Amino acid sequence: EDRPSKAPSFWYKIDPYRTVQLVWKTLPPFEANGKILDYEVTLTRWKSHLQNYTVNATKLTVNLTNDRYLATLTVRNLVGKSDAAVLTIPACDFQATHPVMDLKAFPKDNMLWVEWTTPRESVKKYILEWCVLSDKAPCITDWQQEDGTVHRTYLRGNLAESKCYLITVTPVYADGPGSPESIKAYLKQAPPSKGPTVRTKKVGKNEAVLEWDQLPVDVQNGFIRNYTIFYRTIIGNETAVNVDSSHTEYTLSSLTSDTLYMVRMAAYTDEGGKDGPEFTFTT
Ligand SMILES: [Cl-]
Numbered sequence: 001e002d003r004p005s006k007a008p009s010f011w012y013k014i015d016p017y018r019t020v021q022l023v024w025k026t027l028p029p030f031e032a033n034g035k036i037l038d039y040e041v042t043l044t045r046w047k048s049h050l051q052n053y054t055v056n057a058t059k060l061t062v063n064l065t066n067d068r069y070l071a072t073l074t075v076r077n078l079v080g081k082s083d084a085a086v087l088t089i090p091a092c093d094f095q096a097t098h099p100v101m102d103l104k105a106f107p108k109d110n111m112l113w114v115e116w117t118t119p120r121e122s123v124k125k126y127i128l129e130w131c132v133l134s135d136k137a138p139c140i141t142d143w144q145q146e147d148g149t150v151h152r153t154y155l156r157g158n159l160a161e162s163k164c165y166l167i168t169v170t171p172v173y174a175d176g177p178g179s180p181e182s183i184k185a186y187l188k189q190a191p192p193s194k195g196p197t198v199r200t201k202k203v204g205k206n207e208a209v210l211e212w213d214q215l216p217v218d219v220q221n222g223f224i225r226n227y228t229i230f231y232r233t234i235i236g237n238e239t240a241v242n243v244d245s246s247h248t249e250y251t252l253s254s255l256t257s258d259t260l261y262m263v264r265m266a267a268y269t270d271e272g273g274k275d276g277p278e279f280t281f282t283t
Contacts, residue, residue, distance in 0.1 A: 004082030006031045008039070009145035010073050011127050012087060020069075020089060022060040025145070027075050027082070034077035042072045046091070066092030090176035098178040100169050105185035112159055112187045114167055115152035123148035123178075127170040130155055132163045133184065135216040139166065161188040162221035189222025189269050195276030196227060196265040201249065205283050208252040208261070212276075215267055222269030231263040259283050 009025040022041060041060055042052045046068040053060060071087035090096075101117035114128060126146040131139040144156050159165065165185055171178030192215055202209040215224060227243040229250060243250055255261070260282050266273045 001077075001079050002033050003080035004032050004034075004036075004075050004077055007083045007085035008073055008075050010071070010085035010087055011143060011145065012071070012089060013141075014064075014089070017063055018066060018092070020062055020064050022062070022071060022073075022087075023143075024058055024073055024075075024085070026058060032075065032077060034079065037076050037078070040072075040074045040076060040081065043089075044070045046070075064089065068094075088174070088176050094176055096177050096179045098171055098173070099181045100171060100178075103169055103181045103183050105165075105167050105183050107185075107187050110187070111154045112165065112167075112185060113152070113154045114169065114183075116169055116181070118151040119171065119178075121173065123171050124174055125172045126150055127172060127177075128153070128155065129168045129170070130165050132160065133166050134218045136218060141168075159187045162186070162190045162193075164217055164220065164222075184223075186222055189271045191272030192220050192222070192224070192267045192269060192274040194219040194267075195274040196267050197276050198229070198263050198265045198279045200279075200281045203281055203283065204255070205257040206255050208255055208281070208283070209249065210252065210263065211249045212265060214248065220267070220269065222271060225268050225270065228266040228268065228273065229263065230266070231261055233262070234260055255283055257283050 004027055006027060008027055012020055012022050014020045038054050038056045040054050042050055044050045045065055068091040069089035071089060072084040074081045074084045098119060098121055103116045105112060105114045125148055127143060129141040129143045131141040142157055146153055166182060167185060168180050168182040170180050194215060196212040196215060198210055198212050200208060201211040224245045226245050229241045229243060230238055232238040262280050264278045265276045
């Protein structure tokens with residue numbers, strides 16, 4: 001046989017000394033060239049001694065100083081160890097620059113494609129992170145790695161429908177990271193799983209002020225384009241009104257004094273709408 005053909009994809013996440021969570025990917029069999037026994041990591045605090053760890057996992061958490069660190073990672077099979085994958089963990093006082101330009105993300109062939117403008121400087125590699133935005137879950141990111149030549153690609157892995165992904169592309173140079181650039185996108189959108197709840201702020205005699213709360217990101221199932229307010233009387237006709245997606249209050253005009261009105265709202269995505277709970281009041 002032979003040792004692993006390739007060095008693993010290699011990246012990190014840091015947040016307060018500071019705690020760094022080194023992470024890597026599992027090399028495919030046709031690159032691992034055999035059963036993977038373990039991985040070897042080393043971290044050299046600038047101008048200090050080399051620290052090392054061997055693990056049979058795909059992550060490593062350590063407490064580092066706010067100094068700089070050079071990281072190395074080698075996956076090991078029976079025949080030997082793969083080439084090392086190098087990282088530079090920038091000193092706390094590091095200033096990143098040179099972001100990507102014209103970042104954009106769009107679904108095509110059931111895959112979520114990301115593309116940007118290839119920068120002037122020469123890039124060593126790209127890092128694409130992405131998590132599902134929710135109000136009942138933190139931003140836990142999946143990720144991948146691309147060569148410095150790439151300027152158009154797709155997120156590798158299992159992506160969900162009706163889920164709003166926050167994608168981040170990060171240039172990587174020998175020096176450290178470039179400035180990140182993010183963007184929100186869906187693999188496939190769909191009618192919201194819930195409609196807005198219309199309630200009366202200020203009830204009047206010849207005019208009513210209605211308010212509602214924006215749909216939590218998880219129930220939208222796609223970018224909300226606009227709302228729609230329906231209302232009628234027990235014996236009247238139903239009137240519909242369009243409302244900008246940014247509005248949280250609307251004022252019904254031309255209302256009859258001492259009357260009962262019935263109201264309900266709808267939320268619309270690029271793929272349809274959803275009604276909310278019916279509501280009633282009286283002038
Ligand atoms: Cl990868």
